[PDB]
Structure 1
Amino acid sequence: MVLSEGEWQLVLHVWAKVEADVAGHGQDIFIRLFKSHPETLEKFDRFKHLKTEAEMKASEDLKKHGVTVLTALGAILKKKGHHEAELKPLAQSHATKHKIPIKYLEFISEAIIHVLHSRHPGNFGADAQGAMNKALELFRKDIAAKYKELGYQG
């Protein structure tokens, strides 16, 4: 699949807002993910002990992790589709070291959309959300293709 320049512009416009506070967006996204799909928390040995949202918000390590994840996702989005190089190491670590099913990538994509919708309604209308969903589906499609090449079905 391919996004038009117009769709990329909608994606990058709202992402520019996210970049005004990466750490804050990272926390909301992971808390949303862990609360909506608790099973995903079991994949993080470093955070699986967190019991409440209060504990999650207070975790310095979780906040730092969120910045690392969003920064990588941002680098990929800014390539506007030409992200083959950025995807390689990401796909290998998540398929071989962390063992993350495509299903879980769908869950975090939902968390991202939810948080952007909550925080940036003025820059995340129907068209912009459609553009973001398309960019995330492209991301998941390409990561899935790499998973297969690497020998991981998940």
Structure 2
Amino acid sequence: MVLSEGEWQLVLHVWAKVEADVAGHGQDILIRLFKSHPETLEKFDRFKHLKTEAEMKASEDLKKLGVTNLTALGAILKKKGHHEAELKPLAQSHATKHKIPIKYLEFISEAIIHVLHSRHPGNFGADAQGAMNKALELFRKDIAAKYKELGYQG
């Protein structure tokens, strides 16, 4: 699988809006993830205690993680497929320390698409969503390959 430049531009076009307030998008995405698939929250030893969306929105640390997460993803998307260097540290920590299965990466991918669909209809129509899905499928495919090399293959 390989995205076209046109598809990458649709991806970067909506990400540009995300960057107007990465912290806000991060909260929305993590909260959507945790509510749609509660089991995923259990992987966060530092945030597993949060009981409600209100507590999640009020968590300064969760907001910080959201920023760290989306900024790392943004750097990967901007590489337009040439993200080998960026994927190494991410795959190692998520495979060996956090133990995040591909199934959960699919869940957060679903969350990202849901939030962009809701917040950015102006830059997330059908074709743009297709481009983002293709970019995230590539991300997950390469991460999975790395997982396997690392001995996890979650």
- TM-score relative to the length of structure 2: 0.99
Find the aligned partners of 2:86 and 2:48 in 1 and give their Cα distance: 27
- Report the identity percentage: 98
Q: Provide, for residues 104-142 of structure 1, a one-character-per-residue CA deviation record: whole Å limited to 9, x for no partner.
A: 000000000000000000110000000000000000000
Find the aligned partners of 1:153 and 1:145 in 2 and give their Cα distance: 7
Find the aligned partners of 1:98 and 1:122 in 2 and give their Cα distance: 35
Find the aligned partners of 2:65 and 2:101 in 1 and give their Cα distance: 19
Find the aligned partners of 1:58 and 1:153 in 2 and give their Cα distance: 34
- Name segments (4+ residues, structure 1) moved above 4 Å: none
Find the aligned partners of 2:42 and 2:82 in 1 and give their Cα distance: 32
**What is the total number of aligned residue pairs between the two structures?**
154
CA-CA distance at 1:64 after TM superposition? 0.4
Find the aligned partners of 2:13 and 2:123 in 1 and give their Cα distance: 8
CA RMSD of aligned residues (A): 0.4
2:23 and 2:63 in contact (8 A); partners too: yes
2:145 and 2:153 in contact (8 A); partners too: no
**Secondary structure at the residue paired with 1:121?**
coil
Q: Please, which runs of 5 or more residues in structure 1 have no aligned partner?
A: none
- TM-score relative to the length of structure 1: 0.99
CA-CA distance at 1:153 after TM superposition? 2.4
Task: Name the residue aligned to 2:126.
Answer: 126
